[PDB]
Design a protein around this ligand. Sequence first.
Ligand SMILES: O=C(O)C1=C[C@@H](O)[C@@H](O)[C@H](O)C1
Length: 114
Amino acid sequence: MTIPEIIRGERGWEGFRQAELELLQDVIKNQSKGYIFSCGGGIVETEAARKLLIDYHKNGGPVLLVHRDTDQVVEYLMRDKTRPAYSENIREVYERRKPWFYECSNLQYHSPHE
Ligand SMILES: O=C(O)C1=C[C@@H](O)[C@@H](O)[C@H](O)C1
């Protein structure tokens, strides 16, 4: 089943975050070398997932953070009709997540001429 479909059923956001954690757990040990992975946007707000990322980049890593302007990243997600009414504002999510991304990141890259 799909990700938005998981959000609707008994799973919700509760089970979805542990669905990520178990895949990340499995990927880190099994697919340990020779891959490049795009993680979820909110992987970083599961406490146990942060421990895995931090533990990974403390002994070799690497874990790359990509962060465009905080205005332009917002308008990409605001321009997306799939978004429940009364759900979290993107400003407050990005600002709460920012310190966790840094903590969980080994490397950093932003385009010098965006
Ligand atoms: O902003 C987020 O927390 C998410 C971003 C997407 O990559 C998906 O992981 C999901 O829609 C949640």
